[PDB]
Amino acid sequence: TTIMAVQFDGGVVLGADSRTTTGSYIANRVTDKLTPIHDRIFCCRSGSAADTQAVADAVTYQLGFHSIELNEPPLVHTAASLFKEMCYRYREDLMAGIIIAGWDPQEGGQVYSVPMGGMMVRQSFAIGGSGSSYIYGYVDATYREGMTKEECLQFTANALALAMERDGSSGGVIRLAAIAESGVERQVLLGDQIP
Amino acid sequence: SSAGFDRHITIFSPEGRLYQVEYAFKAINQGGLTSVAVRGKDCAVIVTQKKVPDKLLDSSTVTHLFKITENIGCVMTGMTADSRSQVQRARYEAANWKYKYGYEIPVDMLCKRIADISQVYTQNAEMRPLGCCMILIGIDEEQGPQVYKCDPAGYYCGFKATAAGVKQTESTSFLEKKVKKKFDWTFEQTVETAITCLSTVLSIDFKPSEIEVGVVTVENPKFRILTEAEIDAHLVALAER
Amino acid sequence: FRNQYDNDVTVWSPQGRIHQIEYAMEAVKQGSATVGLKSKTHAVLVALKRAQSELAAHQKKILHVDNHIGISIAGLTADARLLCNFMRQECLDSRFVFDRPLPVSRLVSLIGSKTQIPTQRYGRRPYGVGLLIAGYDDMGPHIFQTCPSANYFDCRAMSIGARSQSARTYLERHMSEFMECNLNELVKHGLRALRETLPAEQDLTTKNVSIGIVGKDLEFTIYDDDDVSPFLEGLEERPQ
Amino acid sequence: YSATVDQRLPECAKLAKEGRLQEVIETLLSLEKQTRTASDMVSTSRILVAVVKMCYEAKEWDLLNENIMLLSKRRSQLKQAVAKMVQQCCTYVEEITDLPIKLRLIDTLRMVTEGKIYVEIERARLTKTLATI
Amino acid sequence: ERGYSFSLTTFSPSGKLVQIEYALAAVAGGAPSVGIKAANGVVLATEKKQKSILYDERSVHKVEPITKHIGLVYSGMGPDYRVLVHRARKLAQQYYLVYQEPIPTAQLVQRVASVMQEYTQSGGVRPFGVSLLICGWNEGRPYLFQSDPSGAYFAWKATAMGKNYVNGKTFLEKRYNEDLELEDAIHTAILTLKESFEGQMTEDNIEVGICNEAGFRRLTPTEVKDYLAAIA
Amino acid sequence: IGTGYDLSASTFSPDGRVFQVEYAMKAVENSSTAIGIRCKDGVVFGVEKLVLSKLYEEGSNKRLFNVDRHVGMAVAGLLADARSLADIAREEASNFRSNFGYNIPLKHLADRVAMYVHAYTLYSAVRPFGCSFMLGSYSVNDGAQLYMIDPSGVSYGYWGCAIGKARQAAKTEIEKLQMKEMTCRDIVKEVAKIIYIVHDEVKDKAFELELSWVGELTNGRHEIVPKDIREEAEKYAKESLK
């Protein structure tokens, strides 16, 4: 798969492909690899869909508990900590990599990557999945600083489309989500919308 | 005729009475405050007396009503420590419910679950039965707003309106006098009726800064805690009218 | 009976006490007196060994736990022995995992935590033993007095046991000299404090006293009748 | 409070000579609301006697009816001031000798008294006025 | 006799456990409930009257179903009734899982009696202050049982427990006939409730439920009002 | 008085009040006096520690702890109770940091420690922790927070409050000080004078004041008062008492 997230001044933009296969047969072409964890914290899953969904539900419950306990929207670092702990506790039997994007009033837009084995780390742009090995050169050639919303959209569009056309494990449609102070906006690219 | 039986919770008195439960109910009124909830066609308003010993006390932390979940609000009285332990337990129960069943807790279900917890608490001799009385409010589809009351005995009930505290009897009588008129109770009307009941049961004509209000409506499913501006507007509008 | 409030550590007094705790505090008084002193570079524990009969050896009151930390007991043999065994195991584990001697402050805090559980929870009796801990750490010598109330104090010197008030006021009187003594003068001061505890008819003989000394380069070693003998040669005569 | 009414009474009467019921009644009502919130003793009586007096002087009654309705339907009225204003009504209900407005006035005085109070006996007096009729 | 009315694990020198008797006394103080085994089915009724009309009568129910063909009512405590409902439902569906067959009402009564008697085994756990009336229909025969806090369970052609249970029992003796039909059984039950209702039963003031070959179901306030008008 | 009901912590009264917690209150006001004030940019704590015997070394029985780096810990009541409660608070804070990867807000830590202290108020096999303690913290993105938490189990926020045998006396004169503006520097003098006037000299003399604080003055790190500030505070207290 292909999950790409990057922050910009005012929020974060995160997109993913929609291919889920069991063998060479495409099990489902309309998968949402982006599972909304909180109102302004979003997740991107890679690997075995069952493990990703299970850990997504578990972290959703834990973070809902934490938020209602603090009566204040959780920090992205906190969420990333739970993802790290859960992934490490089951890494011997977990096939699941998670990219956590979000916005909080404490700092702004935050993106934390947790690849296989549980690297809870932070960076500007994070690309994960089986398709992360095809646009690495392309994203390194196309990445700049100071994105706007429109530029973020185009970056996601072309990068994920190149991963789409070059990798056989990314297909279907493109799912995009932008988190900011205003809120979260979700869009789906299908057909002529993709480049 | 039954003297030693008012010692242990798990001990039945002659005539089948559990004196420890009744003592817990009396302990609810040890706080000395008063809460009351009123439900309209599509709104539910809870209002609680605020008692500030000193300006030294931080008014943001001395609240007597809390929020269990984003759409389910709780207002309660009794022992403050028991109150906070009970709200923590209720939040745990609601979150676990959502985790295991994938959708929000209805007010009645949360009340029933915590009532079962309290019943198990009062059935075994290992527990002091959490002497605090809670009222949950929230919106459920196909049934509108819901107000439910739970007591240390494990008895939960839905209410068109309810009250608790030292002045529970008189507040309930006033609420009965109000409900026998069978009026639709729009949101402002619900709030002003509850405020009038509290004022007449305290006979203090409180200042705006001594009360807390929470409201849940279908158009505002989030359990909103009324800030000073809204409560002041409501009470002055009532006062002029 | 208006004294039904002292049968367990889980009931508060009407005026706000745990009379079982005070009873445990009084319990250690039945034990023999024992005084701990510390120099600039050395720490000494001087205990009055008490024998059940003169046809038998005297009861030991200076337990060694680590080469840098020694302890002295006053009270129940059972509670003191359990505490000492737990000390030995804790020091063993600390050396096994960290390869550094147990800090005295952390050791004493772990004592407080361990003996607090019987005070708080129903079941095991409160540890009714007053312990004098003479340890060495980065800040030099340390003297700790742990009371059966799961409390501990940092004291310049300490006399705990039978008739300890005499030695307490003796050390209060000699406050002004303690910090500048070497081994001989402070050992004599502790011996004189014990003599203050002891009544006139009895003297601090070879079989009567037990001394444990620890320091920076000298391990905590406890002396016996033949070994204590030099340290009692410098002792003076009872001012009677 | 009392200073406000004692400095307002001359100008209030001078304005009352112009009739202009609206602004005077809204101002007096606002002052009554604020003094009832503040729970004043003499200001309430002064305001009520003033409004009843001007209503009598302007030869209209429905305004005083509305005043009694609003004061009765509003809470926090001191007993002494209410007693004084019904006393003034009682000395302002008998001396009128016009049949329709007298019957109307006694009708209102009867129906504004659900929840009889200490000053009931004073209304008893005006009931005997209805006796005459 | 006082020194033995304090524990559930001590025999009084003359008779038996006194805490069990006290639990039964608590049961007798509950809202009156009436069960009737008709020829074609079973009907159980109870009173839901409570002051403070603010109370939502539809919020809680004194009559609940355990499976598609078994229901129950209680007399005594409320929370204990709910706990018994939960235990009965869980146990019935466990039996269903093991056997893939709707639960015979007799077995459900036996096992729920066992689970309530379990709470009477040792001290520190009080017995349930609730008596159960279990109605069911199985193998062409309506079954009505009573389960006790002591764990005793027995059969009942028609019984009445709770407050004023003795006079209701006498009334049932007078009016009951083995050839009774379902609707007439409901009429008799509502008449029994009226005999001690004290305050003009309404559609929601009483909660009734009927079980037959079409399973068990609690009657809605509409049919309750209709039957009340028919009895008048 | 509740005889026959105050023998356990799980038995209510005919009036409906647990007397174990009330005797815990009694023990609390029969203990040392500690006053903590949350300044504009952090919190400070001060403890009145009686020197029972001059044989006691200074710094013995430390009462101003730190549960976390940015979280202080003051306490009055029972020293063993204080140490056990501090240990459990440190364990909770460490668990929070390990599980969540960041610092614990003082409101959350106060609620957790209040629920823990309540868990012993109500069981019969255990007894309530009869000690009342100050939680304090300063975070650059949260603010400055202070909390009284008592054996009953309720945690309440106080700008600056004192507990001990002279709670009423401390409340009498702590109110006159306007707080919400000045910082620890201007509050240390008030703490010193209030503790030197609230201590009784004719009876229960021989006390010492120990101070500590957390805030940006130490980059949000809890640490005891430096000797110079403490001695300046003592001099100000001695001058102000005439």
Find the CB nearest B67 among A61, A64, A71: A71
**Contact assignment for F8 to C116 by CB distance below 8 Å:** no
Structure tokens at A73: 């929207």
**Contact assignment for A65 to B68 by CB distance below 8 Å:** no
| Among chain B residues, CA nearest to F117 | B81
Closest CA of chain F from A69, distance in Å: 8
- How many separate domains does chain B show? 1
- Looking only at the bridges linking them, the beta strands covering F223-224 and E158-161 are unpaired
Domain parsing of chain A, residue ranges: 1-195
Q: Which residue, among C38, C20, C235, C201, has the nearest Cα to C125 in the 3D structure?
A: C20
Residues 6+ apart with CB under 8 A from D105: D61, D93, D96
- For domain A1-195, the question of CATH label 3.60.20.10 is answered with yes
Q: Which residue, among B129, B115, F15, has the nearest Cα to E77 in the 3D structure?
A: B115
Asked if C10 has any chain F CB less than 8 Å from its own CB, the reply is: yes
Contact between E161 and E167 under an 8 Å Cβ cutoff? The reply is no
Q: Distance between CA F77 and CA F85 in Å, rounded?
A: 11
Amino acid letter, E31: A
In the β-sheet with F71-76, what is the strand arrangement from edge to edge? F71-76, F132-139, F143-149, F155-157
Asked if C182 has any chain F CB less than 8 Å from its own CB, the reply is: no
Considering only CB atoms, which chain B residues are within 8 Å of E19? 11-12
**Contact assignment for A60 to B92 by CB distance below 8 Å:** no
Q: Which residue, among B82, B83, B80, B114, has the nearest Cα to B96 in the 3D structure?
A: B114
Find the CB nearest A70 among F99, F108, F141: F108
- Measure Cα distances from B60 to B34, B53, B165, C134 in Å: 19, 14, 22, 49
**Contact assignment for F57 to C154 by CB distance below 8 Å:** yes
Kind and range of the H or E run holding B28:
helix B19-28
Q: Distance of alpha carbon A44 from its chain centroid, rounded?
A: 3
Closest CA of chain B from F53, distance in Å: 36
| Among chain E residues, CA nearest to B18 | E26
**Contact assignment for B92 to A65 by CB distance below 8 Å:** yes
Considering only CB atoms, which chain B residues are within 8 Å of D76? 205
Selected for mutation to probe chain B from A65, A66, A67, A72 (highest B CB count within 10 Å) is A65
Contact between A163 and A136 under an 8 Å Cβ cutoff? The reply is no
Find the CB nearest F102 among A78, A85, A120: A78
CB pairs under 8 A between A and B: 22
Amino acid letter, F89: A
Experimental method: cryo-EM
| Among chain A residues, CA nearest to B102 | A57
Amino acid letter, A22: T
Asked if C238 has any chain F CB less than 8 Å from its own CB, the reply is: no
- Measure Cα distances from A181 to A9, A103, A108, D51 in Å: 11, 7, 8, 56
Asked if B203 has any chain D CB less than 8 Å from its own CB, the reply is: no
Asked if F217 has any chain C CB less than 8 Å from its own CB, the reply is: no
Contact between B146 and B158 under an 8 Å Cβ cutoff? The reply is yes
Phi, psi of B137 (to 5 degrees): -130, 145
Kind and range of the H or E run holding C220:
none
**Contact assignment for E53 to B176 by CB distance below 8 Å:** yes
Active-site annotation holds for A20: no
8-state DSSP, C236: -
Structure tokens at E232: 């008048």
Domain parsing of chain F, residue ranges: 1-240
8-state DSSP, F165: T
Asked if C17 has any chain F CB less than 8 Å from its own CB, the reply is: yes
Considering only CB atoms, which chain B residues are within 8 Å of A65? 91-92, 95
Structure tokens at A124: 């500007």
Q: Is the dihedral of CA F50, F53, F54, F58 positive or negative?
A: negative
Contact between F103 and F214 under an 8 Å Cβ cutoff? The reply is no
Q: Is the dihedral of CA B110, B114, B119, B120 positive or negative?
A: positive
Question: What is the resolution in angstroms?
Answer: 3.1
Residues 6+ apart with CB under 8 A from B64: B33, B35, B48, B49, B50, B75, B76, B77, B83, B212
Asked if C112 has any chain F CB less than 8 Å from its own CB, the reply is: yes
Residues in chain A whose beta carbon is closer than 8 A to a beta carbon of chain B? 57-58, 60-61, 64-65, 68-69, 71
Structure tokens at E174: 């007078």
Cα separation of the two ends of chain B: 55
Contact between B162 and B149 under an 8 Å Cβ cutoff? The reply is yes
Q: Distance between CA D48 and CA A97 in Å, rounded?
A: 78
Residue ranges of domains in chain C, CATH in brackets: 3-236 (3.60.20.10)
| Neighbors of chain F by Cβ distance (3+ pairs < 8 Å) | A, B, C
- CA gyration radius for chain D? 15
The neighbour count for residue B96, using CB atoms within 10 Å, is 14
- Measure Cα distances from D113 to B140, B181, D100, D122 in Å: 45, 21, 21, 12
Domain parsing of chain E, residue ranges: 2-231
Cα separation of the two ends of chain A: 18
Side-chain half-sphere exposure of F6, counting CA atoms within 13 A: 21
Q: Which domain holds residue B230?
A: 1-241
Does E contact B via 3+ CB–CB distances below 8 Å?
Answer: yes
- State the fold for domain E2-231: Glutamine Phosphoribosylpyrophosphate, subunit 1, domain 1 (3.60.20)
Considering only CB atoms, which chain E residues are within 8 Å of B124? 124-125
CA angle B57, B63, B64 (to 5 degrees): 125
| Neighbors of chain D by Cβ distance (3+ pairs < 8 Å) | B
Selected for mutation to probe chain F from A63, A67, A68, A70 (highest F CB count within 10 Å) is A70
Residues 6+ apart with CB under 8 A from B106: B138, B140, B146
Q: Distance between CA D106 and CA D83 in Å, rounded?
A: 17
**Contact assignment for B10 to E126 by CB distance below 8 Å:** yes
Closest CA of chain F from A67, distance in Å: 11
| Neighbors of chain A by Cβ distance (3+ pairs < 8 Å) | B, F
Query: What CATH superfamily is the domain F1-240?
Result: Aminohydrolase, N-terminal nucleophile (Ntn) domain (3.60.20.10)
Residues 6+ apart with CB under 8 A from D34: none
CATH code assigned at B89: 3.60.20.10
| Tokens 């699941």 found at | A96
Contact between B165 and B34 under an 8 Å Cβ cutoff? The reply is yes
CA quadruple E49, E44, B155, F120: dihedral, nearest 10: 150
Contact between B139 and E19 under an 8 Å Cβ cutoff? The reply is no
**Contact assignment for A77 to F99 by CB distance below 8 Å:** no
**Contact assignment for D33 to B240 by CB distance below 8 Å:** yes
Find the CB nearest A68 among B95, B96, B99: B95
CB pairs under 8 A between B and F: 97
Contact between F153 and F9 under an 8 Å Cβ cutoff? The reply is no
Selected for mutation to probe chain B from A61, A66, A70, A71 (highest B CB count within 10 Å) is A61
Residues 6+ apart with CB under 8 A from E98: none
